[PDB]
Automatic annotation (TrEMBL):
GO biological process: polysaccharide catabolic process
Similarity comment text for this entry: Belongs to the glycosyl hydrolase 12 (cellulase H) family.
Molecular function terms from GO: cellulase activity
Protein name as annotated: Endoglucanase
Positions where Pyrrolidone carboxylic acid occurs in the chain: 1
Domain of life: Eukaryota
Disulphide connectivity of cysteines: 6-35
Pfam families documented for this protein: Glyco_hydro_12
Keywords of the record: Carbohydrate metabolism, Glycosidase, Hydrolase, Polysaccharide degradation, Pyrrolidone carboxylic acid, Signal
Amino acid sequence: QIRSLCELYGYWSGNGYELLNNLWGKDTATSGWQCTYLDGTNNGGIQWSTAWEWQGAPDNVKSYPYVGKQIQRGRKISDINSMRTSVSWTYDRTDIRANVAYDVFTARDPDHPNWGGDYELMIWLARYGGIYPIGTFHSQVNLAGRTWDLWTGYNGNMRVYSFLPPSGDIRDFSCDIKDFFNYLERNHGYPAREQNLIVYQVGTECFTGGPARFTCRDFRADLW
């Protein structure tokens, strides 16, 4: 690894991307740790991984290490034409409580801190060990060439829209996240014209299990 980010909130940024050993929920764990590794920044993308093991509180996320696309504040979702992204990843085992997911926050306050927003849009690419997303099942939606189970709910005052694979995982994926926002704008009244993009990330929410290792073979994210 080019960088080993094993400290709590260990951080790297470069080439318009950032990486965080985002162990935000660790104080619910009774044992374990996790490190995030920068493996490369080849071909306009990021290659990274995270190794971990956690015990305690199986319904509590301990971490969401992520790679994020750095963005300038104040971009209204309605004025973002495209958020094309691709990811290739593996997990070394699936007998864990964890997901792989894109995470996007938006807020009417363009200066909202990066830990949340008014809305959260997740696109899950894995759902291991019996975990659930926030909220309840809403409906199925056809986007990005796939069918998704959309779940909706709230985390505090933040409305959360999570698009889940009905079955299995998606280890090689590409989409335009604007398709997901557009769907929400049309059918869910998502107020894209007044929401600003806050974060644009992919990573893995880790609940319990391990030792496990998530390998992101490649990640790329653009927006226009």
